[PDB]
Scaffold this active site. Structure first.
Site, PDB file in Angstrom:
ATOM      1  N   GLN F  11       0.824  -1.205   0.000  1.00 55.88           N
ATOM      2  CA  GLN F  11       0.000   0.000   0.000  1.00 55.88           C
ATOM      3  C   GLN F  11       0.860   1.256   0.000  1.00 55.88           C
ATOM      4  OE1 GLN F  11      -3.113   0.322   3.066  1.00 55.88           O
ATOM      5  NE2 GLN F  11      -3.987   1.863   1.690  1.00 55.88           N
ATOM      6  N   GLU F  62      -3.635  -7.361  -1.717  1.00 55.46           N
ATOM      7  CA  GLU F  62      -5.045  -7.062  -1.552  1.00 55.46           C
ATOM      8  C   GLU F  62      -5.507  -6.119  -2.660  1.00 55.46           C
ATOM      9  OE1 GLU F  62      -2.957  -5.564   1.084  1.00 55.46           O
ATOM     10  OE2 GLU F  62      -3.956  -3.717   1.719  1.00 55.46           O
ATOM     11  N   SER F 131       7.382  -0.526   2.500  1.00 52.18           N
ATOM     12  CA  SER F 131       7.433  -0.137   3.898  1.00 52.18           C
ATOM     13  C   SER F 131       7.919  -1.314   4.729  1.00 52.18           C
ATOM     14  CB  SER F 131       6.062   0.326   4.399  1.00 52.18           C
ATOM     15  OG  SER F 131       5.142  -0.753   4.418  1.00 52.18           O
ATOM     16  N   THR F 136       3.158  -7.349   3.164  1.00 53.54           N
ATOM     17  CA  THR F 136       3.453  -7.427   1.739  1.00 53.54           C
ATOM     18  C   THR F 136       4.785  -6.764   1.420  1.00 53.54           C
ATOM     19  OG1 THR F 136       1.071  -7.351   1.311  1.00 53.54           O
ATOM     20  CG2 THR F 136       2.551  -6.996  -0.557  1.00 53.54           C
ATOM     21  N   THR F 170       2.147   2.819  13.438  1.00 58.13           N
ATOM     22  CA  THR F 170       0.833   2.381  12.982  1.00 58.13           C
ATOM     23  C   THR F 170       0.466   1.027  13.581  1.00 58.13           C
ATOM     24  OG1 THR F 170       0.816   3.646  10.915  1.00 58.13           O
ATOM     25  CG2 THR F 170      -0.447   1.596  10.969  1.00 58.13           C
ATOM     26  N   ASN F 197       8.213   8.583   8.712  1.00 59.02           N
ATOM     27  CA  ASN F 197       7.007   9.369   8.497  1.00 59.02           C
ATOM     28  C   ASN F 197       6.833  10.482   9.510  1.00 59.02           C
ATOM     29  OD1 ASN F 197       5.880   8.436   6.137  1.00 59.02           O
ATOM     30  ND2 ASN F 197       4.594   6.889   7.127  1.00 59.02           N
ATOM     31  N   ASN F 219       4.046  11.871   0.156  1.00 58.80           N
ATOM     32  CA  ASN F 219       4.378  11.174  -1.080  1.00 58.80           C
ATOM     33  C   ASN F 219       4.869  12.132  -2.154  1.00 58.80           C
ATOM     34  OD1 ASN F 219       3.538   8.948   0.303  1.00 58.80           O
ATOM     35  ND2 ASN F 219       1.663   8.620  -0.887  1.00 58.80           N
ATOM     36  N   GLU F 245      28.036   5.675 -10.603  1.00 63.29           N
ATOM     37  CA  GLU F 245      28.617   6.741  -9.789  1.00 63.29           C
ATOM     38  C   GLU F 245      28.008   6.827  -8.403  1.00 63.29           C
ATOM     39  OE1 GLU F 245      31.413   7.786 -10.340  1.00 63.29           O
ATOM     40  OE2 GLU F 245      31.688   8.449 -12.392  1.00 63.29           O
TER      41      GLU F 245
HETATM   42  N1  LIG Z   1       4.975   7.844   3.926  1.00 64.27           N
HETATM   43  C1  LIG Z   1       3.976   7.015   3.639  1.00 64.27           C
HETATM   44  N2  LIG Z   1       3.808   5.862   4.376  1.00 64.27           N
HETATM   45  C2  LIG Z   1       2.795   5.010   4.094  1.00 64.27           C
HETATM   46  C3  LIG Z   1       1.915   5.282   3.060  1.00 64.27           C
HETATM   47  N3  LIG Z   1       1.017   4.274   3.007  1.00 64.27           N
HETATM   48  C4  LIG Z   1       1.309   3.376   3.975  1.00 64.27           C
HETATM   49  N4  LIG Z   1       2.402   3.830   4.666  1.00 64.27           N
HETATM   50  C5  LIG Z   1       3.091   3.164   5.784  1.00 64.27           C
HETATM   51  O1  LIG Z   1       3.027   1.766   5.604  1.00 64.27           O
HETATM   52  C6  LIG Z   1       3.068   1.140   6.866  1.00 64.27           C
HETATM   53  C7  LIG Z   1       2.377  -0.214   6.827  1.00 64.27           C
HETATM   54  O2  LIG Z   1       2.317  -0.726   5.516  1.00 64.27           O
HETATM   55  P1  LIG Z   1       0.868  -1.010   4.886  1.00 64.27           P
HETATM   56  O3  LIG Z   1       0.139   0.287   4.639  1.00 64.27           O
HETATM   57  O4  LIG Z   1       0.085  -1.879   5.839  1.00 64.27           O
HETATM   58  O5  LIG Z   1       1.134  -1.767   3.491  1.00 64.27           O
HETATM   59  P2  LIG Z   1       1.865  -3.198   3.392  1.00 64.27           P
HETATM   60  O6  LIG Z   1       3.360  -3.066   3.550  1.00 64.27           O
HETATM   61  O7  LIG Z   1       1.511  -3.810   2.064  1.00 64.27           O
HETATM   62  O8  LIG Z   1       1.233  -4.122   4.545  1.00 64.27           O
HETATM   63  P3  LIG Z   1      -0.220  -4.788   4.365  1.00 64.27           P
HETATM   64  O9  LIG Z   1      -1.211  -3.734   3.937  1.00 64.27           O
HETATM   65  O10 LIG Z   1      -0.657  -5.400   5.672  1.00 64.27           O
HETATM   66  O11 LIG Z   1      -0.131  -5.864   3.310  1.00 64.27           O
HETATM   67  C8  LIG Z   1       2.387   2.102   7.824  1.00 64.27           C
HETATM   68  O12 LIG Z   1       3.097   2.151   9.037  1.00 64.27           O
HETATM   69  C9  LIG Z   1       2.458   3.449   7.138  1.00 64.27           C
HETATM   70  O13 LIG Z   1       3.273   4.315   7.890  1.00 64.27           O
HETATM   71  C10 LIG Z   1       2.076   6.440   2.311  1.00 64.27           C
HETATM   72  O14 LIG Z   1       1.301   6.695   1.392  1.00 64.27           O
HETATM   73  N5  LIG Z   1       3.110   7.304   2.607  1.00 64.27           N
HETATM   74  N1  LIG Z   2      38.754  22.493 -16.611  1.00 65.65           N
HETATM   75  C1  LIG Z   2      37.682  21.679 -16.757  1.00 65.65           C
HETATM   76  N2  LIG Z   2      37.523  20.657 -15.885  1.00 65.65           N
HETATM   77  C2  LIG Z   2      36.470  19.819 -15.990  1.00 65.65           C
HETATM   78  C3  LIG Z   2      35.491  20.022 -17.065  1.00 65.65           C
HETATM   79  N3  LIG Z   2      34.566  19.056 -16.930  1.00 65.65           N
HETATM   80  C4  LIG Z   2      34.924  18.299 -15.862  1.00 65.65           C
HETATM   81  N4  LIG Z   2      36.056  18.762 -15.304  1.00 65.65           N
HETATM   82  C5  LIG Z   2      36.762  18.198 -14.135  1.00 65.65           C
HETATM   83  O1  LIG Z   2      36.908  16.792 -14.309  1.00 65.65           O
HETATM   84  C6  LIG Z   2      36.755  16.131 -13.058  1.00 65.65           C
HETATM   85  C7  LIG Z   2      35.900  14.899 -13.271  1.00 65.65           C
HETATM   86  O2  LIG Z   2      36.159  14.339 -14.554  1.00 65.65           O
HETATM   87  P1  LIG Z   2      35.297  13.042 -14.932  1.00 65.65           P
HETATM   88  O3  LIG Z   2      33.875  13.437 -15.237  1.00 65.65           O
HETATM   89  O4  LIG Z   2      35.336  12.091 -13.764  1.00 65.65           O
HETATM   90  O5  LIG Z   2      35.985  12.411 -16.241  1.00 65.65           O
HETATM   91  P2  LIG Z   2      35.631  10.894 -16.642  1.00 65.65           P
HETATM   92  O6  LIG Z   2      36.825  10.016 -16.360  1.00 65.65           O
HETATM   93  O7  LIG Z   2      35.285  10.815 -18.103  1.00 65.65           O
HETATM   94  O8  LIG Z   2      34.443  10.410 -15.849  1.00 65.65           O
HETATM   95  C8  LIG Z   2      36.055  17.098 -12.119  1.00 65.65           C
HETATM   96  O9  LIG Z   2      36.830  17.266 -10.930  1.00 65.65           O
HETATM   97  C9  LIG Z   2      35.963  18.412 -12.864  1.00 65.65           C
HETATM   98  O10 LIG Z   2      36.550  19.456 -12.085  1.00 65.65           O
HETATM   99  C10 LIG Z   2      35.732  21.160 -17.977  1.00 65.65           C
HETATM  100  O11 LIG Z   2      34.949  21.409 -18.919  1.00 65.65           O
HETATM  101  N5  LIG Z   2      36.817  21.915 -17.760  1.00 65.65           N
HETATM  102 MG   LIG Z   3      -1.809  -4.154   2.048  1.00 63.07          MG
END
Ligand SMILES: Nc1nc2c(ncn2[C@@H]2O[C@H](COP(=O)(O)OP(=O)(O)OP(=O)(O)O)[C@@H](O)[C@H]2O)c(=O)[nH]1
Ligand SMILES: Nc1nc2c(ncn2[C@@H]2O[C@H](COP(=O)(O)OP(=O)(O)O)[C@@H](O)[C@H]2O)c(=O)[nH]1
Ligand SMILES: [Mg+2]
Ligand SMILES: Nc1nc2c(ncn2[C@@H]2O[C@H](COP(=O)(O)OP(=O)(O)OP(=O)(O)O)[C@@H](O)[C@H]2O)c(=O)[nH]1
Ligand SMILES: Nc1nc2c(ncn2[C@@H]2O[C@H](COP(=O)(O)OP(=O)(O)O)[C@@H](O)[C@H]2O)c(=O)[nH]1
Ligand SMILES: [Mg+2]
Lengths: 49, 431, 426, 107, 41, 428, 426
Positions: F11, F62, F131, F136, F170, F197, F219, F245
């Site tokens: 859920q 469900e 969660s 589930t 909860t 939460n 959300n 990366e």
């Molecule tokens: N942040 C956030 N938490 C959610 C949301 N919906 C459910 N939860 C969290 O989910 C936890 C429990 O999970 P459930 O909602 O029961 O869903 P589930 O994991 O599938 O468990 P069951 O429903 O029993 O199958 C609760 O403690 C809520 O805090 C949401 O929309 N946002």
């Molecule tokens: N002087 C200069 N430095 C750059 C430029 N683009 C990236 N860098 C430097 O290059 C470093 C990272 O290079 P990177 O993206 O890892 O090269 P890669 O090996 O192809 O992944 C960073 O610390 C940047 O400061 C640019 O256009 N000019």
């Molecule tokens: Mg459920």
């Protein structure tokens, strides 16, 4: 309206005390003198080398 | 190929830098994008293979919102982005913040940029510093930048372009603290300090031009004009060139006394210049008028010790010398007895360039005065009297100590500058 | 890059914060749905300080919204601008602190402080550079005055280097809404003077005075007062989030502003306030904002500066203007008033010109003042406490909660120490 | 900078604890200067100032910025060699291959 | 677990979709299309 | 191709598979009828004309939970012979669904697996959902795995099992089935992902805003996890991770193949779009004990290997940075003989949002498969549950009366004891 | 003119060499279909180094496409340059090696070697004078580490007199992909020493640090690093295809680079790497290239030469440059750091100048260096090998594919002998 407001108050103390300028010297200076291109004071003709 | 490197620190640095570099881009044929649609641009500009010119300057400010509009504006493509250095938070009117925590954070970057700008040049002649005495970073970060440059380069000349606090008006509260703490560490490191203020330029704009309520740009344009006229003898031919090294060594008699004033002679609009005769004998005694100087002080009580004529335009020498020979005759303008005839004259063959939207008039003759004067000692007397008012009640001290500073450095700075008062009054007495 | 994490506690501070995020969002061009519709790119350029960009281009704010009773937090997620907040920043409580400092500190604030500190730390460690905290609340009721004070105490422990800004609501002198306000006020200001950096006091009597004799309104609502409070509280962080020709952040407005670490009780103002009938007869100029800023009737603290002397003055100017008017007006406001400033500070004032004005205005300003005259405000609460405590009037709801009688006397001593250490500099 | 082996993963670049790079463009966090220099951002159009924009203009805008509509054009694609190379700027629309030293010298 | 409601709003214009189909017909029909005398006379 | 046959039993299995296949149909273009209005070959197989039938099998004892799904929405999708339904459920009895009611229906399920595998060409692995607390999904799943490991040999299989929760439960006879099917699944599972939460109930109440959930709300989470596992077998990516990366970089020993699953971004639509959901801030949400899906704590044990699977617009730089900053945390402990302890994979496909679900559509996702010694405490619980209740020999008579001998209880208990002593010699 | 047969192994190798063939066809002026769309005659002069001639005047690369994973052969043809590869040269298996050297060498990497060897023997006999082979692969995978080494062994048996090259991608120290990386890495390095002539160590972490600090990219992909690797691989065969004043093929580099037949592990690099915002402002000069080519944060391996000493150094230059200032700069970089070079050698630097730069740049240069600091690469692999082998962890994947426990011990012994061989020169 601010330039209009300044223009209604031209017959004022704005005549003899502007903010940055001194006084309109055209009524005291003849006609079109081109104040930028004018070297006041006497000059010597440099005869007799 | 005599080249200069400019350093602009702070908000007062960056805004003045914007104005002066606009003037430099317009003096040469440089568009704001950097393209030039002659070889006189080497002092302030480099070359690039794309046909592009880059300025030799650095902008530094920990508060970003001053360089951000420079970056966003139309001058974006001109400046080097790596030459525009910003921080994350400001110094917040504290010497300690801009000298001890983020003061040292960005030094190794600015010095690197300066070093790189120095390797691209063959004949370097000096450094121009633009900062504010009463700021947080113009007092903190610039004052240790120049002490580091003095150990990194050595035989060059460090000339600073300082916004000295105005006498009556001022912006901040803790301005005497930062000023007295940045003049402590510059006295034994920097070579000379051409300094201006903001009140005197306000009076000049109100009176000599017709402009009431100006902005900071209307002062920064005059500042860029005088800064260009100082360096005008480098990139343009003339009868008597004055190099960057030479006005480092005929204005300063002793290394503790390197604080001259500043003055631009033909500061005038189109209307008043259009009636005016602009003879050399008429604009060189406008320099000696106390109304036309960018530091508020009365030089009649003081004693002149050194002067530096900087002439540009169509100026023949004997108008100059028959004008200085008139200067020595009046009893009001009086020199100091240990100095004989003490002028330095320089002629340039290039008239000043006016900026569109500017307020000055395109003229034929211009004079830039840099004069050491004993009367600048009154400004220091008022400033440290202001600190002695503040320091008695421990006002704002806790903001300094909990920021890497030490209570004894307030004492060491004030006992340093109490010696400047007894320095200046011993070079003015009868010998 | 200078960003701020904002904190709201209690129903009053919560409604004030709701109006605050009304004003900042209609300043920076934010829709109720959270997106951007402004008319410029300057507004978005400094969206750091108050907003976080989530995914999708939605700018949520750095608001920490906490309360002990949910009856107002549904009204705080309000109609226009209650959905921009993130839902995780709302931190509720069940039983509200029913006008009790003790309940808001010990048996109902302590179990919620640990749940609000984690979100505060989460937001704070995810910042590029934190600048500081603003805590909008009240001192009258229970959850604000207790829980916000406990929050301030806990935050100052783990971030000692930041800025602790508070926008407080001190009980009014003339008509108060509760009666046990003095107790909560003194036990809240005990830990306010030691754990914060800048404190702004806002009275409702002065706000009613503003809404009556300046805006010319007969029956103002609470939203009007909240809009005024938010308008002045938005005006102190402008220069750090909009470009200008002279900038100042919150530390700027603290270094220049407090000479000693324990004299940090400010009193704000808002300059361009004019009525509807006088809208078209008043030119918007600098010598008008400067005149209105230093007017005693323009202010949101009950104390007037005729009684004391300013220690330092802050003035964050906004709009496109000229520096020379600011400079000569600040010089003349000191020269013409030489008997109302301290002689041992040369320049008391501090100016900072931003460039972006508020919504619909062209030129504006924001006053922040540290006057000696704020000692009368604490003198009144100390007088009421000394009249109330000697008969042990309402100690039943405090001592039966987990506090002793000795805790009240230390708060009274700290009040007397704050007041006594303000008269020396007069 | 490199105080030890683990000196990075706290400074910049390797970092995952800040709010930077999450803000979009026109926000001015972290890397934004180098993003406006990108070729994708240049071809984006600029809208005209359309109502209520006289509130949001600065002294730097009215003093140094030049307000003018800008045409938008595409660039002819050119090979890139290193990551971030943008050769489709600079003057010559087609970069001819350089010639050998023999071809230049012996002719 | 109901039959899903595909709230299909178009992310693309009707004109661009018509243009995409119109290009795709010709492109597919061509991509499927790429893939007398003796020596002593 | 890269195909994979899914097996749903119970859920919990079918109620998980309903949501799983709904997500599989909706991730591709498959309709509930099974019609398209070729990366679907992993899960769907094309017929001649137009229909794609799944490669799954639905088993329950469900019919009140499989007849549910053939009278519903997807009644035409599934093949009506892949739905295997029984007549009578195991009724919570391992013995019934393993020995009595399961010995005779498993041939039909084996035939259906074979008939799904002759259609197969490139088979890679088996996905098994059930969660541990039922009859589930405990007994019939065990029987199915035992038969599948013989009929297919080295072909890999993976496990998604709802483990009994520690506190709630909860049934009553849950420990008996959950120990018996654990003893059986130990040798016949290459990898087994445990899910509770109660832990997903806590995740739904805490991460999501949906309370009083149903089984559907769990959300869907489980279906998302299982979709993230096989995401690299269908879609292109920077780092493909295949199923070879998977176990090469996870399991160090053949007896230790129980990893824990974690899904990082779990947020409802009210709160999802106010966050900066980068891989950085969500890859450290995998290590949070609140997000774990088995009701346990990994800080009670040692991490052995972690596989990080990524979705969407993941850039390798940011995952590498976040992972290398994960190791700089003193809270997480790794085993001593694994110095690296990580495996990464990046897929380009963003996760697929289901309408009517609780999750929100996102661009990034992390699936974590951390192999930890902390799963040993899951064995201690039901171990004590059995030996406390087996000593009185309760509920034994149905088990011993339905095809089950008595020695299996003792054998399963001995196997679980050997597992418990196996997980303790690794941690040293 | 010397023909070269290319080999690709693994996903990393296949995605590196696709981009390599892209840049090779891109600098030879070849469209993705295969036709010639160039501007000069030098591009079609020596195209026989990397290409064959098919019908209709089109060109096909001389490459073999090997990987165990069938999924990545799609990602090559469907890429941006997939049409040029011949479909008969694609070889592939069912499943990947799964990060396993064992099945990449014995199980599923040993029956596909016949097809790859048939393709290579088919293709290496279609050329005039074969110079040697190349290999791109990774050490941490299963295909490139397992199949690649077996390929190298088989080709070395079949063609002993040619050259063999390898661009290995070694495991990074701290970032990693696989938990089993040391197992493949040790057992590939053990196979590399006796079968290769030239080996290049590429670390992904070094490439990420390059893309962070130098190029100022905020989110690089893998192609973002394959581009750097491909740029490096093209700069070592530049004199094989374009003329110059001082040419040098692969055999001459090998002769002047490795002094003893086991010490052939190098650290590659690329000179003109600038940010997007500073490439209009920086002039490409030789003092600019050679300053950052010898900078320790330029090379694509996670080894610091300030920890070690340079046995020999190669520098292959492209462009129209002077032949005096390159040698001046080499002596400039060889004399002032006198402790970073071996003393019993005359000259360490190898200078080769190719005339033709990449089309669009001004000048460029490629770095190849033998350092005793390459032993640090093998200590971290040996330590992680002996930490995991002593508990017999992850071993049944290798044992279950047909391998013995003594191969691991003997490979570790070869690794330790290689480490101790390098320590004589430190
Ligand atoms: N942040 C956030 N938490 C959610 C949301 N919906 C459910 N939860 C969290 O989910 C936890 C429990 O999970 P459930 O909602 O029961 O869903 P589930 O994991 O599938 O468990 P069951 O429903 O029993 O199958 C609760 O403690 C809520 O805090 C949401 O929309 N946002
Ligand atoms: N002087 C200069 N430095 C750059 C430029 N683009 C990236 N860098 C430097 O290059 C470093 C990272 O290079 P990177 O993206 O890892 O090269 P890669 O090996 O192809 O992944 C960073 O610390 C940047 O400061 C640019 O256009 N000019
Ligand atoms: Mg459920
Ligand atoms: N003349 C002139 N003075 C300026 C200008 N900009 C700033 N200042 C001066 O700078 C002082 C403020 O201190 P700043 O130097 O700007 O502050 P800072 O050190 O830059 O630190 P920040 O607060 O972050 O800007 C004011 O008193 C002004 O007098 C300018 O453009 N022209
Ligand atoms: N300005 C303003 N004041 C408020 C507001 N709401 C409540 N108050 C004030 O707050 C006081 C009650 O304290 P309160 O902060 O509401 O109690 P607490 O939240 O339980 O600590 C009352 O005196 C109200 O005047 C509002 O919206 N604006
Ligand atoms: Mg600044």
């Amino acid at each position: 309206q601010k330039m209009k407001d300044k223009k209604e108050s031209v017959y004022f103390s704005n005549q003899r005390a502007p903010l940055g300028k001194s006084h309109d010297q055209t009524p005291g200076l003849p006609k079109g003198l081109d104040i930028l291109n004018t070297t006041f004071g006497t000059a010597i003709v440099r005869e007799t080398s | 190929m005599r080249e200069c490197i400019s350093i602009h620190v702070g908000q007062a640095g960056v805004q003045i830098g914007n104005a002066c570099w606009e003037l430099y881009c317009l003096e040469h044929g440089i568009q704001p994008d950097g393209q030039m649609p002659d070889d006189s641009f080497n002092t302030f500009f480099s070359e690039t293979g794309a046909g592009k010119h880059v300025p030799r300057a650095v902008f530094v400010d920990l508060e970003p919102t001053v360089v951000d509009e420079v970056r966003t504006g139309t001058y974006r493509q001109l400046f080097h982005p790596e030459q525009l250095i910003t921080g994350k938070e400001d110094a917040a009117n504290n010497y300690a913040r801009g000298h001890y925590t983020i003061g040292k954070e960005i030094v190794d970057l600015v010095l690197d940029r300066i070093r790189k700008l120095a390797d691209l040049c063959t004949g370097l002649q000096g450094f121009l510093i633009f900062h504010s005495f009463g700021g947080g970073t113009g007092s903190g970060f610039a004052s240790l930048l120049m002490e580091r440059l003095s150990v990194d380069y050595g035989k060059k000349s460090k000339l600073e372009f300082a916004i000295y606090p105005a006498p009556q008006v001022s912006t901040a509260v803790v301005e005497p603290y930062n000023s007295i703490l940045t003049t402590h560490t510059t006295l034994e490191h920097s070579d000379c300090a051409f300094m201006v203020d903001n009140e005197a330029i306000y009076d000049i704009c109100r009176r000599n031009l017709d402009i009431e309520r100006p902005t900071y740009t209307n002062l920064n344009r005059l500042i860029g004009q005088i800064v260009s006229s100082i360096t005008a003898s480098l990139r343009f031919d003339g009868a008597l060139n004055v190099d960057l090294t030479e006005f480092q060594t005929n204005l300063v008699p002793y290394p503790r006394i390197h604080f001259p004033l500043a003055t631009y002679a033909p500061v005038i609009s189109a209307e008043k210049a259009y009636h005016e005769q602009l003879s050399v004998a008429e604009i060189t005694n406008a320099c000696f008028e106390p109304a036309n100087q960018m530091v508020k002080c009365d030089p009649r009580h003081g004693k002149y010790m050194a002067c530096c004529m900087l002439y540009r335009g169509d100026v023949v020498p004997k108008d100059v010398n028959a004008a200085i020979a008139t200067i020595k005759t009046k009893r009001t303008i009086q020199f100091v007895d240990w100095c004989p005839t003490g002028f330095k004259v320089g002629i340039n063959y290039q008239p000043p360039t006016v900026v569109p939207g500017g307020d000055l008039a395109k003229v034929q003759r211009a004079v830039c005065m840099l004069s050491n004067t004993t009367a600048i000692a009154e400004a220091w007397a008022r400033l440290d009297h202001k600190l002695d008012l503040m320091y008695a009640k421990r006002a704002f001290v806790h903001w300094y100590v909990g920021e890497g500073m030490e209570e004894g450095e307030f004492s060491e700075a004030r006992e340093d500058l109490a010696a400047l008062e007894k320095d200046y009054e011993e070079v003015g007495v009868d010998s | 890059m200078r960003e701020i994490v904002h904190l709201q506690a209690g129903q009053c501070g919560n409604q004030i914060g709701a109006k605050f995020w009304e004003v900042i969002s209609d300043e920076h061009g934010i829709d109720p749905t959270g997106t951007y519709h402004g008319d410029s790119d300057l507004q978005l350029e400094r969206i750091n300080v108050y907003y976080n960009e989530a995914t999708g281009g939605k700018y949520v704010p750095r608001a920490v919204l906490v309360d002990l009773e949910p009856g107002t937090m549904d009204s705080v997620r309000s109609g226009p601008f209650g959905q921009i907040f993130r839902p995780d920043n709302f931190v509720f409580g069940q039983s509200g602190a029913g006008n009790n400092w003790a309940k808001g500190h010990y048996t109902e604030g302590a179990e919620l402080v640990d749940s609000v500190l984690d979100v505060v730390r989460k937001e704070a460690e995810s910042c590029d550079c934190l600048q500081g905290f603003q805590l909008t609340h009240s001192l009258g009721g229970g959850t604000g005055s207790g829980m916000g004070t406990l929050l301030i105490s806990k935050i100052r422990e783990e971030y000692p280097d930041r800025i602790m800004n508070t926008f407080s609501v001190v009980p009014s002198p003339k008509v108060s809404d509760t009666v046990v306000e003095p107790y909560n006020a003194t036990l809240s200001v005990h830990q306010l003077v030691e754990n914060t950096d800048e404190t702004y006091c806002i009275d409702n009597e002065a706000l009613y005075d503003i809404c009556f004799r300046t805006l010319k309104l007969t029956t103002p609502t609470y939203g009007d007062l909240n809009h005024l409070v938010s308008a002045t509280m938005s005006g102190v962080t402008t220069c750090l989030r909009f470009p200008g020709q002279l900038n100042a952040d919150l530390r700027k407005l603290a270094v220049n502003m407090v000479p000693f670490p324990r004299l940090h009780f400010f009193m704000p103002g808002f300059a361009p306030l004019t009525s509807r009938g006088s809208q078209q007869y008043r030119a918007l100029t600098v010598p008008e904002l400067t005149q209105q800023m230093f007017d005693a009737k323009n202010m949101m603290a009950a104390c007037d500066p005729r009684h004391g002397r300013y220690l330092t003055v802050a003035a964050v100017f906004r709009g496109r203007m000229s520096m020379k008017e600011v400079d000569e007006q600040m010089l003349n406001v000191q020269n013409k008033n030489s008997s109302y400033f301290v002689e041992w500070i040369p320049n008391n004032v501090k100016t900072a010109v931003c460039d972006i004005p508020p919504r619909g205005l062209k030129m504006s300003a924001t006053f922040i003042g540290n006057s000696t005259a704020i000692q009368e405000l604490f003198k009144r609460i100390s007088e009421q406490f000394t009249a109330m405590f000697r008969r042990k009037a309402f100690l039943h709801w405090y001592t039966g909660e987990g506090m002793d009688e000795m805790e009240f006397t230390e708060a009274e001593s700290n009040m007397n120490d704050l007041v006594s250490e303000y008269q020396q500099y007069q | 900078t490199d105080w030890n082996d683990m000196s990075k993963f706290f400074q910049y670049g390797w970092r995952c604890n800040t709010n930077e790079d999450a803000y979009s463009n026109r926000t001015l966090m972290g890397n934004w200067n180098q993003e406006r220099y990108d070729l994708k951002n240049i071809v984006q159009p600029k809208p005209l100032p359309s109502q209520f924009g006289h509130y949001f203009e600065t002294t730097y805008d009215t003093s140094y910025n030049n307000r003018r509509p800008l045409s938008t054009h595409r660039f002819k694609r050119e090979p890139h060699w290193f990551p971030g190379h943008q050769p489709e700027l600079v003057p010559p629309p087609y970069k001819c291959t350089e010639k050998s030293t023999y071809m230049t010298s012996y002719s | 677990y109901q039959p899903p409601k595909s709230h299909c709003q178009p992310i693309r214009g009707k004109r661009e979709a018509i243009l995409e189909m119109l290009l795709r017909q010709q492109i597919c029909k061509e991509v499927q299309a790429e893939q007398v005398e003796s020596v002593t006379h």
